[PDB]
Design a protein around this ligand. Structure first.
Ligand code: EUJ
Ligand code: EUJ
Ligand SMILES: *[C@@H]1O[C@H](CO)[C@@H](O[C@@H]2O[C@H](CO)[C@@H](O)[C@H](O)[C@H]2NC(C)=O)[C@H](O)[C@H]1NC(C)=O
Ligand SMILES: *[C@@H]1O[C@H](CO)[C@@H](O[C@@H]2O[C@H](CO)[C@@H](O)[C@H](O)[C@H]2NC(C)=O)[C@H](O)[C@H]1NC(C)=O
Ligand code: NAG
Ligand code: NAG
Lengths: 723, 723
């Protein structure tokens, strides 16, 4: 009962190194062991995520409501109380695992408890008083989704944005200084003209030069001055040159470069925190004998507690992939690579087909015939020729019918001809190659998806479900097969499906900024923007709704900007998307400040600066990884190839018979005894594979400075171990 | 007469290495020597620049004319003929220096000759027919300003933009594909509504989605669809996410990264071309004796032909700065650094003041008193306190008079008080420190400039020149002294005045693109945009001019976009500046295509793509140098310090007395004999200094990969010298 506890403890060191969890709270007794095992399941993590996500989606039914998803007050009050009681349960369990003095000194959980208390109080107050009072405190509910376990990549990306901020504030102050001094000069220089609303007072000049900084009103702010004297253009050319190009691009460059340094040091601390965890494990399950290493028995002991649900054959394969020195041990120089070998799935190599050992003759020659045709290199060039003729046919047919062919109910017979060609090619390729060897490649999956989508649209249209005619409209997506002919598109699309979870983990951070601004925007600008209001401002042309009664036609004209409300969480989300895309944001701004005070100008200006810093950091960081991996693809997942013999299995099998483990492991090794006998051979070659994570790109980016990190790390450990 | 020709030839090798000129055309005979000396003066270079710049400014008087600078047809025809005859003179002289077979095989001069012939022909045709016909061929006159000698940094920056182009065209084709396929889907999906002009035909959908790619009409193109069904926002969110953010930022990232690689290889070829020039010079004027090096006599021979107008004292100082091994020779390892030592100016070190050896007592104690006060560290903190009180006074005074104080004729007496403080501080600092030691620093130059500017505005206002009141309006530029208190602003402003010629050399390339587009735009869209036209389009609201006659006021309302003409070269320059700043470009586009055909849509789309690639490359390249030199300034011109003794001057003086050179050199060395005797010392310490060029930043950027370049270069030379 000793070595199994060493195995459990060493697997805890590896999980605790993976999840970036501090080594002071490593469990020693059985009480802290059971608490650690109670918290770190996948049930508890999914309970955190479902509770937090239900709370954010509970904001969809509260007091500014989508009118069909509206509940009464006591219903969503008690749902809010129930979800907060689940959060109390989770903080009690983490308080059970960690100590009290470790719990209090961790700042994120303490802020989470204070937000928990305030949300609990106003939930009870809304439950008693029967009416929702203000509810601005909802905007702090992003901390329940950030502080979970699956959203670590969101939490770190927010923290590094707020840590990139002190170089931003300095040059921002340099920006606002020149903006004010050109507002003073502009007020003196252009206010005597009675024919402009722009430079009339001081706040009109300061607001209009802040909007001109975003270039949202550039010709319109210059024209009443440019009509009087044509030398008034010098003011705006000098202003845009100094302020926009030089200073604002200097601002974004400085913020992004401190963001890269902060990420580089965060990745450094993550590698070094993994490395000490491996060193504690090797300290725990070494031999302490005349050889210094790890035997196969202890490595079996790691893999039966770290990464369970794993075959004994796969376990032996990972051991031989870690050996690398051909002695029956593991040194630290070869045990420093657990995380990148224990994460790969092992497959055998079989050269037979999946339709030949089952059927007899005279269809055996058929499936041989289809395999020869589908792997002939003339069938491929023929199919590219079919795609090219299809595209030229579509283009000439749009020049014939003047683009009017995309409105009729009548399916062209040419569409039926090409759909039969891609269909027959789909059956011949999926049968002559095998459906396992068909869904392997991504392009075959794309062609199957598009062609089966077009059969669905064709069948639904002959079923007279006319809203499914847009599938018939999307014909030229079949021309997207033609892009694998060029090399650079293969690089772009492979990198696009490699960097996809990282892009989702950054879009979620941008959605957190939208969520807090949308809740403040709902509770203060709820019922202001109506049709045909704001007629005392300069934006009366845009909030208008005029009927006419010529004939019996009741033709209406309207300016449509009364639809950018803050009535719901959904109308406010599409409004904040219209403010991220920078154009015409001053119209929504000055409509709201026509109805409310001027401090709502302060709202929209703050949202502009926040969304611009966040958007440049997200786009630049993703595209730096994107360009690096394309150029690396022109410098040259990963595939390892190892093998075993039957002589290397005689040592393995009697150990499982002697130690008396489970039964499925033993019978698995009996099955590979049979598979060695059927082919009449001893040495059998296996094949390992795993998909690229973001840490592999981060190792290839910073490759020239990693050994320096490990040397400085070992020196720091010698400072602690000499003391 | 032998060694002087070796000196002349070696100085030609160093000039030919500096100017990036090929070594096949090195002159051998006296004929090619006199031709090389006739071409490479500073008179010939300034003749090239003045001819080309007069030709581009001759386009200001031609047939679309600024109406006050308008000439007749024969006057500017003969000016065009005279300037082209000067260009014929220059090509005849370069044909005199280079061979014929070298002249023909150089592509830039051959294109320059063909443009010379065509411009010569249509100049004669305009001179005969008395009316200007079309004159689109003017747009190729940028090649006369690019192909000169002072505009090498413009020529290289244009060439690398056109060499960055094949990765651009590929992803641009990927952009236009998804734009068309969403135009087909959008035409099907939103055309049945009678209340929108956007998706009505096919060309309206393709044009409006190309404009939506620039985000110039984003809310307005969505709103008539978003009013019908609110789920129509999914189309535009998916379109902007895939097309704008991902693909367009991928486009700009790929173009900028190939631009950096092209610049890296161009800088590599420039260093290696300098290095072979130094190797030819060391081959030419070595000893060929028992020591292998360069004596002082031959190094005097270089400096009397390379870098003339140089003292013999400065010549000896550069030799001792090149020695670095304390033997009377120069090896190649210390002669590889000519260009960075021969470019620095040498000064002595003197600790006396400039107002003490002239005046007697009782004012000697006065100027001592002002020096002690101006260097006291309490006078400085006092002056910062004066600036801070001045700024708080300005802010509170704008809150008092509601910003209305910037309109009155009355000068505030507070302005007179602070102006007397800065004036007295200016005289006390410029007298207590010395005007040579006052104009050294940049901030003192700034404070002198601002304060003397304010005396000029005050004196002109008491002279009742009321248009000089804007100097009184620009009070808060005196608050810009307060920014040297923080470290990061000192870094930003020092880097801004270091990277300034490079920024001018990139703005000139952007002006060449404006020039060619402005000439095509003048000759095809001359008299189209009038007041109150284009009333059949959707932009009738913007080209309008309506009078009213209420009372006797004749108040007018107008839409002002008829002022963005193409009538002149100046109206077209401010119009193209309004198209670089992206906002509201489709209004100018659809006004022009209301008057002309649809191929002018093809004009404005091409100009958008060109100006976007050029603007991102310019901004990103400058800001990469900017951030690198700020972070390098937190890692740690250049200053060298060498000395000589009188014993080291006894060797120098008798060589100039024996060889019998000039007289001013000998008398200069007699003057430093006197300056050594007056202080009663032998060793005297001198001080060298030069300002940072762009090649020093380029050496510090690529520092980790330069020795690899020199090794590969030496291997290439051994491949040629073994054969
Ligand atoms: C406006 C907020 C600006 C925040 C900008 C400052 C952000 C900031 O530096 O974190 C410092 C701490 C939070 O820091 P905190 O997150 O509590 O603690 C860190 C995490 O534990 C991190 O784990 P993961 O990141 O999950 O992997 C760990 O690696 C770090 O250890 P290390 O140092 O050895 O690397 C810890 O220092 O304190 C707060 O920030 C409280 C936040 C309360 C929020 C209040 C308002 C909602
Ligand atoms: C639309 C034009 C696109 C141009 C994009 C291609 C530009 C391009 O690659 O240069 C190739 C040559 C010009 O090349 P060209 O300039 O004539 O010749 C180069 C220069 O002499 C350069 O000196 P500097 O640049 O002054 O320092 C030198 O270093 C290079 O030698 P190296 O290789 O050993 O380094 C030469 O190859 O040919 C043309 O380009 C003719 C241009 C006529 C313009 C016609 C229309 C106005
Ligand atoms: C601008 O809109 C306001 C609505 O807030 C208009 O005020 C109303 O005018 C009508 C008749 O003109 C009156 O019957 C209402 O009582 C007014 N409402 C209020 C709250 O006073 C105003 O007339 C409009 N101004 C225009 C069109 O110039
Ligand atoms: C649109 O503009 C055209 C100008 O091209 C106007 O046509 C002119 O109309 C006036 C009187 O309506 C006639 O005297 C002119 O002879 C017309 N010009 C031409 C060239 O025929 C037209 O009226 C305008 N339409 C509007 C304002 O609805
Ligand atoms: C316009 O007419 C509709 C009915 O056709 C009516 O409901 C609406 O209130 C009218 N809008 C006005 C008068 O502003
Ligand atoms: C408007 O009135 C001015 C005179 O004040 C006149 O010159 C101009 O032509 C008028 N514009 C019209 C009638 O469109």
């Amino acid at each position: 009962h000793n070595w199994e506890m060493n195995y459990q403890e060493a697997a805890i060191y590896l999980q605790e190194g993976q999840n970036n969890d501090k080594f002071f709270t490593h469990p020693k007794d059985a009480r802290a062991l059971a608490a650690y095992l109670f918290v770190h399941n996948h049930f508890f993590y999914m309970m955190e995520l479902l509770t937090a996500l239900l709370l954010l989606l509970l904001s969809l039914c509260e007091s500014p409501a989508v009118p069909v998803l509206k509940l009464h007050t006591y219903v969503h009050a008690t749902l809010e109380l129930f979800a907060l009681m689940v959060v109390v349960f989770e903080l009690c369990m983490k308080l059970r695992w960690l100590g009290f003095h470790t719990f209090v000194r961790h700042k994120r959980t303490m802020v989470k408890t204070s937000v928990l208390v305030v949300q609990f109080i106003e939930a009870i107050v809304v439950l008693v008083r029967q009416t929702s009072h203000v509810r601005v405190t909802r905007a702090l509910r992003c901390i329940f989704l950030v502080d979970c376990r699956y959203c670590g990549g969101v939490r770190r990306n927010l923290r590094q944005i707020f840590q990139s901020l002190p170089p931003f504030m300095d040059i921002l102050l340099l920006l606002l200084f020149f903006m004010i001094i050109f507002a003073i000069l502009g007020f003196y220089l252009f206010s005597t003209n009675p024919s402009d609303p722009y430079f009339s007072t001081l706040e009109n000049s300061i607001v209009n030069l802040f909007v001109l900084l975003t270039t949202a009103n550039f010709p319109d702010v210059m024209m009443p001055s440019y009509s009087r004297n044509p030398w008034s253009c010098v003011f705006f050319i000098v202003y845009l040159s100094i302020e926009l190009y030089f200073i604002m691009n200097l601002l974004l460059a400085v913020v992004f470069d401190t963001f890269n340094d902060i990420e580089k040091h965060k990745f450094k601390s993550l590698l070094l925190h993994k490395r000490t965890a491996i060193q504690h494990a090797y300290g725990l399950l070494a031999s302490q004998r005349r050889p210094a290493g790890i035997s196969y028995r202890q490595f079996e002991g790691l893999m039966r507690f770290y990464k369970p649900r794993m075959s004994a054959r796969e376990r032996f394969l990972t051991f031989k992939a870690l050996n690398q020195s051909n002695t029956p041990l593991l040194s630290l120089k070869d045990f420093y690579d657990i995380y990148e070998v224990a994460a790969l799935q092992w497959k055998a190599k079989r050269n037979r087909q999946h339709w030949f050992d089952e059927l007899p003759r005279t269809a055996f020659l058929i499936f041989k015939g289809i395999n020869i045709l589908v792997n002939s290199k003339a069938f491929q060039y023929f199919m590219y020729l079919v795609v090219a003729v299809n595209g030229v046919w579509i283009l000439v047919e749009t020049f014939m019918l003047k683009g009017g062919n995309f409105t009729s109910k009548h399916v062209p017979w040419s569409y039926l001809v090409f759909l039969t060609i891609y269909g027959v090619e789909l059956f011949m390729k999926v049968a002559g190659l095998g459906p396992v060897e068909y869904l392997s490649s991504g392009w075959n999956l794309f062609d199957f998806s598009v062609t089966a989508f077009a059969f669905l649209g064709l069948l639904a249209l002959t079923l007279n479900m006319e809203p499914f005619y847009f599938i018939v409209v999307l014909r030229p997506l079949q021309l997207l097969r033609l892009f694998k002919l060029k090399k650079r598109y293969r690089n772009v699309l492979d990198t696009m499906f490699e960097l996809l979870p990282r892009m989702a983990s950054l879009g979620l951070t941008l959605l957190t900024f939208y969520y807090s601004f949308a809740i403040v925007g709902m509770e203060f600008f709820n019922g202001r923007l109506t049709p045909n209001c704001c007629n005392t401002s300069t934006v009366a042309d845009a909030y208008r709704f005029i009927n006419h009664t010529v004939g019996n036609k009741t033709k209406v004209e309207e300016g449509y900007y009364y639809l950018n409300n803050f009535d719901n969480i959904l109308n406010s989300f599409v409004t904040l998307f219209e403010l991220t895309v920078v154009n015409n944001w001053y119209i929504i701004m000055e409509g709201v400040t026509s109805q409310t005070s001027h401090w709502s100008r302060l709202y929209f200006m703050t949202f502009y600066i926040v969304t611009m810093v966040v958007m440049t950091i997200i786009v630049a960081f993703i595209l730096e990884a994107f360009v690096f991996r394309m150029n690396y693809s022109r410098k040259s997942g990963i595939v390892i190839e190892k093998e075993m013999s039957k002589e290397e299995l005689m040592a393995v099998l009697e150990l499982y018979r002697e130690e008396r483990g489970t039964s499925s492991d033993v019978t698995r090794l009996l099955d590979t005894l049979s598979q060695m006998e059927k082919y009449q051979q001893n040495s059998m070659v296996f094949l390992g594979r795993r998909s690229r994570t973001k840490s592999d790109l981060s190792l290839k980016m910073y490759q020239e400075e990693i050994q320096e990190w490990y040397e400085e790390h070992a020196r720091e450990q010698e400072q602690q171990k000499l003391r």
